[model samples]
Target: GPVSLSTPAQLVAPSVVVKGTLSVTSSELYFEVDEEDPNFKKIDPKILAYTEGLHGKWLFTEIRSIFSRRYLLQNTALEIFMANRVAVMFNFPDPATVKKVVNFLPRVGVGTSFGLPQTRRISLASPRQLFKASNMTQRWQHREISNFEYLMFLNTIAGRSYNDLNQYPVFPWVITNYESEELDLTLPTNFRDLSKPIGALNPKRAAFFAERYESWEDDQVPKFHYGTHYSTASFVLAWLLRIEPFTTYFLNLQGGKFDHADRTFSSISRAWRNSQRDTSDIKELIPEFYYLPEMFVNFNNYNLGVMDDGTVVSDVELPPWAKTSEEFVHINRLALESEFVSCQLHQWIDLIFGYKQQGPEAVRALNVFYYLTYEGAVNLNSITDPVLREAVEAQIRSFGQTPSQLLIEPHPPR
Candidate 1:
């Protein structure tokens, strides 16, 4: 499935690694200081909007945007299942109970202020009482954002509380590419360093729902499920079967699918919606999983699901087959681990100190997340640098799960 391009490494999407003096066509993005940015003084409008509409289909999209492309699990089915799981967990009366709750299910809809009739009136999804009822709780209620929302909410609150929130500046839907070298690379000095490095954070503290995801037809769950052992076992099955997420996305892209993560988000949600509605029981036949507890998201976090009215669904669950609570723990740990492999956030700090730095690894490490070139230099603003792109792609390819981890064929239908 590799694209044997005349150029060096094959690119699946934009790029993974970034470095040294490259140019980008994206919008003017920024990694602003806490004191300089408005997020420091005012509430983030995006977070408020998304948390407000956390009950509907768009909920899946808002939360899932935090996931990187390399983590695109087994298939759209698994992704959908995780989305549903997040929804159920966040809204379920008895989160521990396995029975599905159709009655009193909070329906996310357009705001009444937008012109709906009184009958279709929409108050906030859950009031303070709702928070008391559920095991999940959010702190700030003085503001009118959705009650506590999801895990992402807590992360944002923490950053906001400390006035240390770090986000990619918006320039008409494009992230700015500050010269990676010019940026402070000091350890524990910059936001990226002070915050947990990508590979070190764990996903164990998340809530996952994996009940009743079986189908009457095929089993063979994909690598992206929330089921206790489905994805784990299925991943092994896929290794034996010679198929994987990278392989599949590679093939799909080769076939003209851009493999853009946002498009994947919409497709995965739509597919799961269809599967749930179908009576064929084929939903469980394929290997699909969704992710509910996402911890890797920060400012430049894209894919926060937007409603038709542009409202973000920050409170929704992914799907049943999505990553389980335990899985999230592993994922976060993996993210932290990945940071050390290519670039350590602290190493970048050395260069920022202007000590006539021994090596430029610090600069490269600083731009590891968004940068994609390795021209032996530091330039953070180039989103299109092939070096950074290839570097990031390679990092993603080597990221957490193995084929034996998240994909497996289910047993025959009973």
Candidate 2:
């Protein structure tokens, strides 16, 4: 009898750490306003409410993006993007700023077009004996088959999300501070009530969004409901994740091979890509978060990026309504010019405080990110000069970033 070893096997360690410090940065606060059509007003309250909810959604997206970048792909599966990738790209001033900046453009698409299609050709893709001869194989002898067989098993259960019969609510209110529309003045609420006199005058701005489309199914509605801005952004993001892996598998079908001993490792790139796309989409959709003054309506694409140094960068294009300082009085501008956003200091502080008071589920999710980002720093320390301090700084900036864009700022009550 002869014994043979097939595929190489090695164990990888999880490196991220999570401390419960809620450090916020002013740079994280951003404004999302419609720039192209200042005249365009959101008719639906769900749209407005979704925008308000995004303040939190975008923040989480930032966390997830960095977390995935640092920990998701240890194998360097995608040579093109994540070869030795670290310090995920976390952007600032978010999607709202970018959308508003691009408002003046004649015609713009709501989403980017992306995908890769594959034709399933029936063939003897794998060894026939592998499935039937499991009894004859020794322990760990059939390990290589696990990846392929598992992928096929997954394919059997999976179906196109668009093909699913379930439908979502046509138009309904997604976020409302009040449980019901009651005129009765409930006892003064928490810290959010402290801003009272101003709150009374400004009024809690209600958001609305309309998804009345001929293509939308009217039956029972979809399983995935994107009533809130952030939810819509997330639902679509999951779709983006499906894109690249679908493409890679297409390549593999065409025999575009990988260098690794295991072909399974390459799909990790698809996972990493989905994570990055989620973060990017969140940054792009942040403008659904707020109502801007008429002056800032024409501005749109505020490009935000997370630097290797853990700094958040922004490129803001000023609209016709924005005021120029005395230094620029002479220039008559044909179109709005882009500029860097001024950081919002107070809002970031509020964010750290907000996390402690969030619901239990939110805390759990935050904990996951905290561990990832913290471990990401530890991983960095091992490779370079101790750069954990830089990672910590970046996390703190995110906390500070939340408050500035919110119409109402309320710290969680202990």
Candidate 3:
């Protein structure tokens, strides 16, 4: 097998997807898989046969960065970034074989830090250096980063993927004092007013969603200011219903079942009292609710069922200064690094990823949604019905997308 190049790949991973071939040798970089991959004929044969022996080569000095991901505008995958942070994406079927495997991976020596010296070999990973608003507020006031590494680098420059739950990665509900047993973080009224948009933080639901966006005399109505989606995929499987690959991704987004122990996520002060007065609980927070405390534990004990207020739904309940579940994620990451949320985390990053996320500053900050969760609302390459473009790309991969705007104005604070 004299191979220094091969293809027909897939690896994908974060919750599996195999089908391989991917070679690229003369020192390393591989991936085996395909022992008749009909996606390994539907699961649980110990979940994926021969492919289980990953041994998938790496030694081009255990790579450290390889780049090229560009989703919709396609660059066709490739990530790599090996050694400890352990990354390994690969998709290639186009984008000229992912730029001929990122220019034959540093001419087969593959590295960024692994092979000692650093001359710099290919690294175009710039969504403007990961959402630069003056390089993310000068690396978050020069502490060089951490509000969970600047929101995992603005959820990797807004292509946000914890393997996609409608772009699942949007945070900020910086404590509005859930029965405060002590989180004062220098109290700015115990936080959360980071410039509105949890369906307008209840100023009478922001004047009834700004009076239904100026009394719409609908000419085929489009006037919206919140019709759900502050992160869906059924609100991230109802706050990751006691986890396990998101409880098998929330029972395959609920068709396989599980939501309804009076609508899960059994209580983080009853989901901040339904995001403070539910207009469909406008939501926000899921970077594992402030850095994963084993997602509020039931740690796969499963059962998750009894609440008709007869309680019983395992774990996830703390508040009133969190005595468990890792002290409620160490008080939700110290109320999300509160100096009162790092001085309004740039007005909650201008209502989640900038300039109030859409025109007229998202109709003056009720920070609208459900215009198919905005990002140029609807433009599936200007739709032309192939089964209404797969049910409008499966309702934009099941609502709650919004990031990727990065900013237009008013975002600089910190």
Candidate 4:
């Protein structure tokens, strides 16, 4: 048994965390669970959730990218990004055991073995840096990458992991005129201001947030402009409830219940309007919004209930220009890469990844959020309290994350 290893572990499954034991041998890595997870067992094993052997085992060559990830608060896990998108996080009982397995796995030639891809120890340190260390934007400007590819890079580095739900990927609200009969890309009014955070776009709402921050009396908790974040676990699931795994994941996240129908993402115009009118709602689109049309259609017949306006919540309501779900995706994709977008997308890059993300510029821009959401605000690793840390992490996850500032100066125009 010295050459092979087996240890008690937990598989961070799509629907639920399953109690399991992970075993590693020369040729393959395996996670075996004797008991099926309760919530997971309820899923129809055909689609993403219940496919047999997908998450259980894989050959060394299938190990595409394995790295240590800081699970919320203080805990960490050896993450194996697998099963279509990112999947199972191999969780140990303690960091000591996690240390043992992480140290020993590569020894079994997990990285250096013939035919295995070189495993890089990245992201654990800083996904923002990992992305910044590369010339992602430089490539974007050179026309080496499309708008789609550029955003894909931002999402990964901004802490968007599939199935994690809490820290899902984020995209900018590129368009503003959701009501027009036709979207004319040439008009500047159709585009959202790239320099402002989504929350700051509405002047009255920005004033309200600014007033709230200025009048705050709290001394212990730092003051913030907007209470809710642009992206969160609940927001992501609501938008993707028509899709699999997420429906189950969302059900589980809400203790096996769905949010009220009014909150359901029924229409694109409704969403944009709500984000503008409603003080707490400041959501941006996800990467899937522009690319994945399947999510827009209720292909699985998910009964998301009828809205207050007497509209049935089935397929997502498209804009006036998009006649079909398929057409909408093409138009959306086209909008992202249009010449109009190329001009100001760099300002957006500056807000999320460059100089204005933090400190003085952020305050001036009225782009502040809850203090816990900022990078380096509170070090969970430094917190010795086992109980208090979870409470803190809970808020951090629900609120949304801010990417580590990537640029120190203004990003040049594309």
Best model number under TM-score = 4
Worst 10 residues of 1 by lDDT: 164-173
Clashes of 1: 82
Model 1 regions more than 4 Å off = 1-15, 21-138, 141-151, 155-269, 274-414
lDDT for model 3: 0.66
Per residue, candidate 1 scores C-alpha lDDT tens digits across 33-77 of: 223334323533322232211212222232221111111221100
Rank order by lDDT, top first?
A: 4, 3, 1, 2
lDDT of 3 by residue, 344-393 (tens): 67777777777787777778777867666655456554566667865876
Show pairs that collide, candidate 3.
Answer: none
Candidate 2 overall lDDT versus native? 0.21
> For model 2, where is the 10-residue window of minimal lDDT?
333-342
Q: Write the residue-wise lDDT of candidate 4 on 157-188 in tens digits.
A: 55456645565667888888877789997888
Which residue runs of candidate 4 sit more than 4 Å off their true CA positions?
Answer: 1-10, 18-21, 33-55, 73-75, 82-87, 91-125, 255-257, 379-390
- Weakest 10 consecutive residues, lDDT, candidate 4? 107-116
